[PDB]
DNA sequence: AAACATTCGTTCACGTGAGTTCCAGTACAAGTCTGGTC
């Protein structure tokens, strides 16, 4: 689950553990935020979202199911 | 005028429906143990 306020991002797991270190707390750093920051529309500054985090292979353009690996 | 049959209000036993308490079956939620990898 992702919390967004302006340029500030925060991520939480199923049981409540912080994961912002991995996914980035600002567009300058991270593994997802620098690329998803510009996806949001002009009028949206505060947001809470819930979803799944997955691994994507661009070569085959396919989701790699995280059975137990990668 | 006397004897026998019938009828009536009473009595007991037995059966059936509704209320109450107790326990078993069911459901759901949380806890505990386990598995696999990166």
UniProtKB/Swiss-Prot annotation:
Organism: Homo sapiens
Associated clinical condition: LIG4 syndrome: Characterized by immunodeficiency and developmental and growth delay. Patients display unusual facial features, microcephaly, growth and/or developmental delay, pancytopenia, and various skin abnormalities. Severe combined immunodeficiency autosomal recessive T-cell-negative/B-cell-negative/NK-cell-positive with sensitivity to ionizing radiation: A form of severe combined immunodeficiency, a genetically and clinically heterogeneous group of rare congenital disorders characterized by impairment of both humoral and cell-mediated immunity, leukopenia, and low or absent antibody levels. Patients present in infancy with recurrent, persistent infections by opportunistic organisms.
Assembly description: Interacts with XRCC4; the LIG4-XRCC4 subcomplex has a 1:2 stoichiometry and XRCC4 is required for LIG4 stability. Component of the core long-range non-homologous end joining (NHEJ) complex (also named DNA-PK complex) composed of PRKDC, LIG4, XRCC4, XRCC6/Ku70, XRCC5/Ku86 and NHEJ1/XLF. Additional component of the NHEJ complex includes PAXX. Following autophosphorylation, PRKDC dissociates from DNA, leading to formation of the short-range NHEJ complex, composed of LIG4, XRCC4, XRCC6/Ku70, XRCC5/Ku86 and NHEJ1/XLF. Interacts with DCLRE1C; the interaction is direct. Interacts with APLF.
Job of this protein: DNA ligase involved in DNA non-homologous end joining (NHEJ); required for double-strand break (DSB) repair and V(D)J recombination. Catalyzes the NHEJ ligation step of the broken DNA during DSB repair by resealing the DNA breaks after the gap filling is completed. Joins single-strand breaks in a double-stranded polydeoxynucleotide in an ATP-dependent reaction. LIG4 is mechanistically flexible: it can ligate nicks as well as compatible DNA overhangs alone, while in the presence of XRCC4, it can ligate ends with 2-nucleotides (nt) microhomology and 1-nt gaps.
Tissue: Testis, thymus, prostate and heart.
Protein name (Swiss-Prot/TrEMBL): DNA ligase 4
Top-level taxon of origin: Eukaryota
Entry binding sites for Mg(2+) 1: 52
Family: Belongs to the ATP-dependent DNA ligase family.
Subcellular location: Nucleus
Annotated positions binding ATP: 52, 66
């Amino acid at each position: 689950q992702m919390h967004k306020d302006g340029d500030v991002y925060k991520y939480f797991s199923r049981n409540g553990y912080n994961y912002t270190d991995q996914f980035g707390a600002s567009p300058t750093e991270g593994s997802l935020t620098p690329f998803i920051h510009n996806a949001f529309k002009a009028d949206i500054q505060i947001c809470i979202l819930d979803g799944e985090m997955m691994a994507y292979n661009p070569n085959t353009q396919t989701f790699m199911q995280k059975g137990t690996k990668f």
